[PDB]
Design a protein around this nucleic acid. Sequence first.
RNA 1: UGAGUAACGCUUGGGAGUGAGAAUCUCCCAAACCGAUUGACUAAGGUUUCCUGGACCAGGGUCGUCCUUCCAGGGUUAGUCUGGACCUAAGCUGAGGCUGAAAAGCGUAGGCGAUGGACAACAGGUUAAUAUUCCUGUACUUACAGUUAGACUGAUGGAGUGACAAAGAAGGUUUUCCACCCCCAUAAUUGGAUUUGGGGAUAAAUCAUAAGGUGGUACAAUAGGCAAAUCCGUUGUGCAUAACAUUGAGUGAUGAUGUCGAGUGAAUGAGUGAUCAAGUAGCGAAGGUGGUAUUAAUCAUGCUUUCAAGAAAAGCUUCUAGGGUUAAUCUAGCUGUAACCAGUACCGAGAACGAACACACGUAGUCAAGGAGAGGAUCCUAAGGUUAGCGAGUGAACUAUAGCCAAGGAACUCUGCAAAUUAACCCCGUAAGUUAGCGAGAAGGGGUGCUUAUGUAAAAGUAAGCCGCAGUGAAGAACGAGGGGGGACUGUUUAACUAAAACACAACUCUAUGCCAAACCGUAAGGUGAUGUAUAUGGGGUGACACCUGCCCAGUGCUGGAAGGU
RNA 2: AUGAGCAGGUUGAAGGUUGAGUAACAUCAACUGGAGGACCGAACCGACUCUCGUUGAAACGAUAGCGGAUGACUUGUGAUU
Lengths: 119, 285, 95, 48
Amino acid sequence: SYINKPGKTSAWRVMTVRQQVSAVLAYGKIETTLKKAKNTQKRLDKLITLAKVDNFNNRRQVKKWLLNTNLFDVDQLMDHLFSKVAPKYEKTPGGYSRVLKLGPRRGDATEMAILQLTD
Amino acid sequence: PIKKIISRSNSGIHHSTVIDYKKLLTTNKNKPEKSLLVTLKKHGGRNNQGKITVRHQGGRNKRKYRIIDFKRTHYDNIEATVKSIEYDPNRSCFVSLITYANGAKSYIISPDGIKVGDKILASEHPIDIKPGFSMPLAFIPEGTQVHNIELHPKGGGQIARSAGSYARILGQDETGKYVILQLLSGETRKFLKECRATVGVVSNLDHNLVVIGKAGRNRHRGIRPTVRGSAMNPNDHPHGGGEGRSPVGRDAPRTPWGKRHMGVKTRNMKKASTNLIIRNRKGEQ
Amino acid sequence: DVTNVLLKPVLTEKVYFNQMGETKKYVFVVNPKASKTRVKLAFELVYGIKPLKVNTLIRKPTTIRGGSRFPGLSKLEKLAVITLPKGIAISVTGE
Amino acid sequence: MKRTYQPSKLKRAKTHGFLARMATASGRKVLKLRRKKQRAQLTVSSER
RNA sequence: UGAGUAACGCUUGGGAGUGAGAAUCUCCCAAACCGAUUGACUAAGGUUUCCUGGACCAGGGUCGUCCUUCCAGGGUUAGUCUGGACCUAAGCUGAGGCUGAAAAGCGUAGGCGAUGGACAACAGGUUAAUAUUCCUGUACUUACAGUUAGACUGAUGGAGUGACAAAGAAGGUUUUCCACCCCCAUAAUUGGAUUUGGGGAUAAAUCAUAAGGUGGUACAAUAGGCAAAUCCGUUGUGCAUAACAUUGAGUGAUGAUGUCGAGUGAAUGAGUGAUCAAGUAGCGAAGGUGGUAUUAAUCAUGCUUUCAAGAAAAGCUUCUAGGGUUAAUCUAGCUGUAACCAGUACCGAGAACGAACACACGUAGUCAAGGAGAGGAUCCUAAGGUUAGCGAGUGAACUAUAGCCAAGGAACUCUGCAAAUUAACCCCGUAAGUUAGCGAGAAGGGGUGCUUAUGUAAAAGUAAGCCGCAGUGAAGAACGAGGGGGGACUGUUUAACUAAAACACAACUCUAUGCCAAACCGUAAGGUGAUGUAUAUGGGGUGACACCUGCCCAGUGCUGGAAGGU
RNA sequence: AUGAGCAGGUUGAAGGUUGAGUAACAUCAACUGGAGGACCGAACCGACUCUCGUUGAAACGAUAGCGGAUGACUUGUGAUU
Ligand SMILES: [Mg+2]
Ligand SMILES: [Mg+2]
Ligand SMILES: [Mg+2]
Ligand SMILES: [Mg+2]
Ligand SMILES: [Mg+2]
Ligand SMILES: [Mg+2]
Ligand SMILES: [Mg+2]
Ligand SMILES: [Mg+2]
Ligand SMILES: [Mg+2]
Ligand SMILES: [Mg+2]
Ligand SMILES: [Mg+2]
Ligand SMILES: [Mg+2]
Ligand SMILES: [Mg+2]
Ligand SMILES: [Mg+2]
Ligand SMILES: [Mg+2]
Ligand SMILES: [Mg+2]
Ligand SMILES: [Mg+2]
Ligand SMILES: [Mg+2]
Ligand SMILES: [Mg+2]
Ligand SMILES: [Mg+2]
Ligand SMILES: [Mg+2]
Ligand SMILES: [Mg+2]
Ligand SMILES: [Mg+2]
Ligand SMILES: [Mg+2]
Ligand SMILES: [Mg+2]
Ligand SMILES: [Mg+2]
Ligand SMILES: [Mg+2]
Ligand SMILES: [Mg+2]
Ligand SMILES: [Mg+2]
Ligand SMILES: [Mg+2]
Ligand SMILES: [Mg+2]
Ligand SMILES: [Mg+2]
Ligand SMILES: [Mg+2]
Ligand SMILES: [Mg+2]
Ligand SMILES: [Mg+2]
Ligand SMILES: [Mg+2]
Ligand SMILES: [Mg+2]
Ligand SMILES: [Mg+2]
Ligand SMILES: [Mg+2]
Ligand SMILES: [Mg+2]
Ligand SMILES: [Mg+2]
Ligand SMILES: [Mg+2]
Ligand SMILES: [Mg+2]
Ligand SMILES: [Mg+2]
Ligand SMILES: [Mg+2]
Ligand SMILES: [Mg+2]
Ligand SMILES: [Mg+2]
Ligand SMILES: [Mg+2]
Ligand SMILES: [Mg+2]
Ligand SMILES: [Mg+2]
Ligand SMILES: [Mg+2]
Ligand SMILES: [Mg+2]
Ligand SMILES: [Mg+2]
Ligand SMILES: [Mg+2]
Ligand SMILES: [Mg+2]
Ligand SMILES: [Mg+2]
């Protein structure tokens, strides 16, 4: 069998994580598949804890992950993260995000999951 | 004369040779006269039914026919002057654009030895023994070269029209007509007294020694590949079949259509022109 | 002359878009065998104002009611677009 | 690949058209037979 | 039954909305591929598949509120575009006529037949769907009539032009491009910012000027051009560094107080709001200077060389014939009238065409961006376009595609099959053999990055310094040597198992053929050979080049032969 | 029969001009010239090899290599056997 689809490559996985984490930081909720939310959670928590010092080095580190969204750009998402979201989690020992399971999709029966910022 | 071609193209080696067409032709450029120019339609070896009739013909380049005055009888008693020796793609011999005194132009088969400015004149009296002069066969002294011989009186030139072709006069006959003509291929014929011919040998005497060097040159000349009969199937040719390279196998070689063809004579002896032939390249009659 | 080459006027979005703004353009359906000159003569003999120019359209027949138990073809139409001069606008109905 | 049938509006009409069939005795006989079978599409001319 | 099994035929995430129901529909933001193309214009073909609204019987390899599916309505505007009313090529038809049991075949005059020739329109705007067609602006062409002025008008016929090959290289002018300048927006909290990004346009037509290109110019005689000629052709004379005739890309002025234009950007109304409305209407600045040792287009149907010697007719000009003379016709100007018929939608193809399929196949031409690059090669993107019409998991055996593999390096196998090494540019060097052309990119080696300075029009290069394990740091680039068999070579061949030593090829030889030629298609007419003429044509065999080709005429074949026998 | 196409880059023949040379030829050197069934290599044409597929995506293809690529070339339209 040949002329197969490119597939879930490592680059595709990193880009998928980037898109979901940018969206979850912009809006605050993501309705995705459970196995994708359980992988985006790691990057979300890592970004939030590294964005707690607010130095230019930390901005350069985050910019390798953030992407442009509808509600914020790549530069205003930075201001939202470092001034609104991250300062809230200033003394929380990890676990800033929660993943909960919704019902199965009508056309896939796959388990959906909502990823949210735990207040 | 002939001139070699040094290809120096490293795909085989071919010592190709071509006619110079530079020291033999007046102008190297191709400027034929518009008036005497009709285009030729390539039949391709196919008859009116569209079926291949003469094999190995087809694929030549586009040509325009130059009207040649083989008869040379209309403007008799009128002096003509050669203006240029040119190249005719439809015949091996060069053609001369001659002009008559009244201003008419025509193309004739160029005799060898004539140059630009040589006077020509045809009629049915002695005239003069000059190269290109056309007179009836009665008045030509025996021994001179003659070309463009007319078979039927008042017709046009038919014999000795190719490059380097000529015929010799060998006296007369006691009949009072049928002057003797020794032609090429060692054949002796009896040509009628009133028949008209032109003296001189036809030009381009070195057309024998031209050597083609490539398949493409012969293909552009208008010759298609000829397949041997030994390579054929047992169908479509008598010399076909076999298991490997096989000999003729029959009692004699055969045509594709199945006749003996080897050494057999294929002339219809019950012809009105048989009595006018003295020798047939081998013996009497 | 006989004036059987003016079958039916037609009113569409395109027709009303043209039929406003100084020069009016009236679109009729005509005999498919008729020519432009015959159309101008018919308008002369039945309306009275010389057309400035005439344009013609031929709409090819096509299948209609496809998939229906008995399918049928369309009818051949020739459309004519008359344009009267500046400032004149006559009514298609009412004579 | 280049399949056998390459459509052409002219070649079709000039080979199997009504005028082509009405030019020889064989074509007239073929048209007579098709009329006997009462074919709605007598020739390729009546494409529509 | 196999069996709810194989398969579902190259492309992701999220937010908002509609809806009874959404991975699949709409919008938005990204993301990933194409970018000598999945981009744009059309020929052929397809024949409504095009636009709007609605629907989800059936079709869509899943779903579906959605579709190239179905229903209803609508959509294709020409004196100048593509073809007829114009002309011919191959070829077809073909009154008479020829040939033939019949049907019919051939063929003259005529008539058709583009893939060619001739012919007058460009720029912008507009609708959901058409636009050199509709609208605005500015033009051009052909007919008819009246009129003014001038002139003798001159074809169904003659002549000239139309009218032409392949390859190659120089010029002239515009360009591409480079530099400067003008105008618009921008001034940036992540360390430093004194900048960053974008645009710089106008056609057909009219008038004037045209770099140049092409070819000698007038006068006089003429017997030749189915009659005639003042035209053509021919022959003389004079002048011929030029004149004369024809053609000619570009330039300037009107066309243009116009249009387009980067950007700026609403109102009105829908809506709960945002948003739509729309980034729409409207507004809309600059709209230039110089160079070029770089570019492509035109002049150009120009020029040179070579042999394989490179369409016809219409049309245009001209000539008399023929018609006028108290006229007709033509030319130039003005006024007015008219310009017919068919096509014009959409697709133009990993979904509209030919392949039965929304099939990994195939289909003429035209436009061709930037960086590096010889390049239309290669990598990434621009204008633009798509979301490969089943998904979500897991990362067992096993399979396909890739990547890597320590030591050995063909020990594997029928065989180094396959895979691997080399690969671009520049600088050295290059053998045996030879038909002196080649072999040859032979073999074998070296350098490539960045900075400074010197070099140039730009370079290339040169000198010094710096970094890394590695510097055409990634993509795209030949593995080599030796001996032998066959074919000289370039080529052609069994569409879909055999590309080869087979076929062909240039060359050699034999044979037939004197022209109403031999040979060949048919029954014959007719035709090919050939509008050719033994330096030519047909057939058999061998297959560059070099050296050779021996003996047998008993049998067979072929040619000739006196008589004699049957 | 009538049209169209072959990005780009190399090798540098015949011939001609000049000079030396020859009693005059021959010959040699420089310059010009741009030929080749020439060379490398895209579009284009073809199909030599491995693998996959063999109830296929496909009643003959896909990926990776491969041969020709100014000519006995390729191709569109029309006619014809
Ligand atoms: Mg990658
Ligand atoms: Mg032959
Ligand atoms: Mg021959
Ligand atoms: Mg065989
Ligand atoms: Mg036999
Ligand atoms: Mg045999
Ligand atoms: Mg044997
Ligand atoms: Mg129309
Ligand atoms: Mg069964
Ligand atoms: Mg079952
Ligand atoms: Mg089973
Ligand atoms: Mg199973
Ligand atoms: Mg499966
Ligand atoms: Mg699919
Ligand atoms: Mg998918
Ligand atoms: Mg890309
Ligand atoms: Mg396309
Ligand atoms: Mg339909
Ligand atoms: Mg639609
Ligand atoms: Mg709808
Ligand atoms: Mg369904
Ligand atoms: Mg108009
Ligand atoms: Mg016609
Ligand atoms: Mg045409
Ligand atoms: Mg459109
Ligand atoms: Mg800062
Ligand atoms: Mg006369
Ligand atoms: Mg002619
Ligand atoms: Mg269109
Ligand atoms: Mg395709
Ligand atoms: Mg199809
Ligand atoms: Mg598909
Ligand atoms: Mg195409
Ligand atoms: Mg490019
Ligand atoms: Mg590319
Ligand atoms: Mg490695
Ligand atoms: Mg490694
Ligand atoms: Mg190893
Ligand atoms: Mg080792
Ligand atoms: Mg071994
Ligand atoms: Mg072993
Ligand atoms: Mg190999
Ligand atoms: Mg070697
Ligand atoms: Mg040996
Ligand atoms: Mg060979
Ligand atoms: Mg070969
Ligand atoms: Mg085969
Ligand atoms: Mg094969
Ligand atoms: Mg005969
Ligand atoms: Mg003939
Ligand atoms: Mg042989
Ligand atoms: Mg041999
Ligand atoms: Mg022997
Ligand atoms: Mg004997
Ligand atoms: Mg005998
Ligand atoms: Mg070559």
